[PDB]
C-alpha cells in the first residue's frame, strides 16, 4: 500500500499563483520519482514535470517558466507551484510515482478550475 492523494484550491481566479500538494504514503520520496500530469476536460494527458529521488527536476518545455516542483521529504509531500494562472490551466492534476520507466501508482487527481 502505496498511496498518493492530491489536494488543491478548487476554483481560483486567473493570474493568481497556486500550489497543489501530492501527499504520499508507503514509500520514500528519496527512492522514487514523482511526476506531475494534467488533463484538461475532455482532452488527453499532458506531462508537466517531475522531481527525481535526488531532488533534480525536469519540466515540460512549454510550461517551464510558469512551473516549479519541490518536495518535503520529511512530510512526504510533493508540490506543484504555478504562477499566473490562465483559464486554460483548467484541468485535473495528478501526481504519479515513477519506478524504472513506468508510472506505477497514480493519485485520484484534483480538479483546478480557473474562473474569474
Amino acid at each position: 500500500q502505496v498511496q498518493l492523494q492530491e489536494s488543491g484550491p478548487g476554483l481560483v481566479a486567473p493570474s493568481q499563483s497556486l500550489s497543489i500538494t501530492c501527499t504520499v504514503s508507503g514509500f520514500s520520496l528519496t527512492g522514487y520519482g514523482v511526476n506531475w500530469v494534467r488533463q484538461p476536460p475532455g482532452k488527453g494527458l499532458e506531462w508537466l514535470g517531475m522531481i527525481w529521488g535526488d531532488g533534480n527536476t525536469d519540466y515540460n518545455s512549454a510550461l517551464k517558466s510558469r512551473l516549479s516542483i519541490s518536495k518535503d521529504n520529511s512530510k512526504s509531500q510533493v508540490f506543484l507551484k504555478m504562477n499566473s494562472l490562465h483559464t486554460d490551466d483548467t484541468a485535473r492534476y495528478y501526481c504519479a510515482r515513477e519506478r524504472d520507466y513506468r508510472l506505477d501508482y497514480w493519485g485520484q487527481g484534483t480538479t483546478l478550475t480557473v474562473s474569474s
Binding site: 494527458l45 506531462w47 520507466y101 497514480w106 493519485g107
Partner: protein, 107 residues
C-alpha cells in the same frame, strides 16, 4: 521534443472483437514506451512498459509491440472492462510526453 501520435483517435468495437492501436513517435524512442488505460472518472492505470512487458495483473489478452518510432497495442477479444481511453507515453530522455489518446467505445 518527441511527440507521440496515436491512431485511431476513437474506435467503436463489440465485445469479443480484436483491436490494434498505434502510437508513432516523431523521433526514435528506443523501446522506452508505456501504455495506460483510463476509465471514466478514474486515474490512468499502467498496462504495459518497455514496449512488451505487461504490468502485474493485466490480462494476457493485451500485448504490446514495436521499436524505433512505431509501437502497437493489440487487445484480443475485447471484454466490457476494456472500453475506456488508452494512452502511450515515452521515457526517452526528457521531457516525457503522452500520445493524444485513443477512445475505445462499445458498439
Amino acid at each position: 521534443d518527441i511527440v507521440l501520435t496515436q491512431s485511431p483517435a476513437s474506435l467503436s468495437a463489440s465485445v469479443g472483437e480484436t483491436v490494434t492501436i498505434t502510437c508513432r513517435a516523431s523521433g526514435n524512442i528506443h523501446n522506452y514506451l508505456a501504455w495506460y488505460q483510463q476509465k471514466q472518472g478514474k486515474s490512468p492505470q499502467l498496462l504495459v512498459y518497455y514496449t512488451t512487458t505487461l504490468a502485474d495483473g493485466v490480462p494476457s489478452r493485451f500485448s504490446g509491440s514495436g521499436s524505433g518510432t512505431q509501437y502497437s497495442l493489440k487487445i484480443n477479444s475485447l471484454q466490457p472492462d476494456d472500453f475506456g481511453s488508452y494512452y502511450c507515453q515515452h521515457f526517452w530522455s526528457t521531457p516525457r510526453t503522452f500520445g493524444g489518446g485513443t477512445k475505445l467505445e462499445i458498439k
